[PDB]
Every structure is written in C-alpha cells, then in structure tokens.
Amino acid sequence: GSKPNYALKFTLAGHTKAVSSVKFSPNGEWLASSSADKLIKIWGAYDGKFEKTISGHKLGISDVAWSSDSNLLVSASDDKTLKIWDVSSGKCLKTLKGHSNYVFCCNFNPQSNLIVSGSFDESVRIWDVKTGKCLKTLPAHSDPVSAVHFNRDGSLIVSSSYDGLCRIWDTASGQCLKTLIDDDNPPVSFVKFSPNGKYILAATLDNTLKLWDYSKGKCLKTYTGHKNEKYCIFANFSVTGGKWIVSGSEDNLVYIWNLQTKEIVQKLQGHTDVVISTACHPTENIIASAALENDKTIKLWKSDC
C-alpha cells in the first residue's frame, strides 16, 4: 500500500555494551553489527540467526561497513585503527594505522579498492584495501568527523563534522569540490549520498534531516518530528517498496517519512534506549535497528510495502 506496516519479527541479543552500527550485506544474506564491547557480530538477515563474532580491536567500535562483493568488512575503532576482515574466516587481513584519535566512521567505495575513514582527529583518510597503506590524508574539518560516504561511481566523498560543515571531496586528488553546508553550528551528525548520487541526506543536532541537491547546493526536503540533539544517528533511503527516509531517534523510536511528502508514515516502538543505527535490506522490505547501552539489542522489522 501507500504506507509501510513494519512489524517486529526478531530481537538479536549478544552485545554486552551499546550497539554502534548495523549494516546489511549487499547480497542480502547477513547483518553485521559493531559495538562499544569491541566486537563485530554477523547474523542471518531473514531469521536473525547468530552466525559468528569477529574480535581483535583493543577498544570499542563506532562503525562497520561491507565491501561491494559482501566478502569483506571494515571497522572503525577507539583504538585509532581500522581493521579489514575476511567475513568467511573472521580473520583480520589488515590493520590501518595513521589516525591520531578515535576512528568514528568508514565505508568502501563501489569498486571496494579504497576505504574512506573519519576520525576525532578532524581528518578524513583514504586507504588502499590491497596493501592497507594510507594513500591520502585530508585536513577535512576543524572538529570530529561524524560520517564519510562515496557516491555511486566512487569519484566523490561526502564528509560531515561537529564543525557544522558538510564537504564534498574529489576522490582522485583529495581536493575539496564544495562546502555544501557552511554554518558555525549546528553540528552535522550524519551525511550520505542518495542511491543515484544526485542528493545528500544530512542530519544536524537540531532534530532535523535535510535532502540537498548536490549540483545546485540547495535544500529540497526537510524531515522533522524525531529527537536528535546529541548522537550521530544514521539515516537511510528505503527503496525496495515505498520511497521512505528512515532514522533512529533519541526517544527510542525508529522514524519513517515519505521522502516526497515529508509526512511521518510510521514510528516503530520496542527499543528501551536511543536508536543509534538503522539499515534497509537491499531487496526485501526489512529494517534493522540498534540501541545504546540500556538496550544493547538489534531488532529486525518487516513490511508488506
């Protein structure tokens, strides 16, 4: 129908501290979760079946991300490293060293030959996956970097920071193409490209999501009604059924908006702490949500629409 009817299907228990990030594998088979407990867990996407724990970081993990072929993970840790993992073997292939403070956010490019990282050290780093070498250090921001993301052809990087800026970077040169949001405040807590790479979805810590036209540098849509003043809460484009925007909230709910109309079309109740991370399954109408340390669970929700 015109509205989704997401209902709780599974609750995934096992993390012993706050969950930080959940991501579906591109092939749809797996959910990966990262946590302040220093662990990555892999779960069945469709039945929530616990598969394995992946360990090696010396401190908490803020983010995890999948290679395009679903074979590798990269994790971002308070131990100042990223780690590249073979999902099949659970083994650490590379440790990426160079950030001088917590690594907060990470992503592969579509090619999955590069990793982009953002740190509390106010830099964005670009890494070679094959060698684990740092190729470029961008002096991107003047406060912690909250999010980094490649566009669909890999030619662009978008970054966000507590400095209140969203910047777009030329991957090849590392040179800044655009400062898309230029305010002293509020902090920009999350950014990502739209699937078609024309738009940027940006969260600010004034309880606001905004869809920006990258080329024109203009705000096309605003999404409000949720609570976001403190945490770097992920947001998603839901594209498998109706065209939604999805975000967690500091009132312990998952919010779903109609992308075009900006109306709230569902609020998902069940979590007992801040919903820090949501993910949308690549082929099925399935959302994964994850909560901070009062809850420490992941929930899988399914919709007919």
Ligand X SMILES: O=C(Cc1ccccc1)NCCCCc1ncc(CO)[nH]1
Contacts with ligand X by CB under 6 A lie at 20-21, 62-63, 104-105, 146-147, 190, 230-232, 234, 276
Closest separation in Å from C-beta 192 to ligand X: 8
Nearer to ligand X, 4 or 37 (CB): 37
Nearer to ligand X, 274 or 286 (CB): 274
Nearer to ligand X, 40 or 276 (CB): 276
Give the chain's end-to-end CA distance (angstroms, integer).
6
Closest separation in Å from C-beta 89 to ligand X: 25
Closest separation in Å from C-beta 305 to ligand X: 27
Q: DSSP for 197-244?
A: SSEEEEEETTTEEEEEETTTTEEEEEE-SS--SSS---EEEE-SSS-E
- Dmax over CA atoms of the chain, in Å, equals 50
Nearest CA to 76 out of 50, 25, 40 is that of 40
Q: How far apart are CA 275 and CA 82, in angstroms?
A: 24
Closest separation in Å from C-beta 234 to ligand X: 5
User: Under a CB-based contact definition with an 8 Å cutoff, are residues 220 and 198 in contact?
Assistant: no
Closest separation in Å from C-beta 1 to ligand X: 31
Q: How far apart are CA 192 and CA 236, in angstroms?
A: 8
User: Under a CB-based contact definition with an 8 Å cutoff, are residues 267 and 283 in contact?
Assistant: no
Closest separation in Å from C-beta 272 to ligand X: 16
Burial (CB count <10 Å: 0-12, 13-18, 19+), residue 91: exposed
> Ramachandran region of residue 184, left (φ > 0), alpha (ψ -120 to 50) or beta?
alpha
Q: How far apart are CA 259 and CA 191, in angstroms?
A: 16
Q: How far apart are CA 146 and CA 232, in angstroms?
A: 6
Nearer to ligand X, 194 or 303 (CB): 194
Nearer to ligand X, 35 or 171 (CB): 35
Nearest CA to 20 out of 248, 281, 287, 256 is that of 248
Nearer to ligand X, 91 or 230 (CB): 230
Nearer to ligand X, 12 or 265 (CB): 12
Nearer to ligand X, 62 or 81 (CB): 62
Closest separation in Å from C-beta 216 to ligand X: 25
Closest separation in Å from C-beta 83 to ligand X: 15
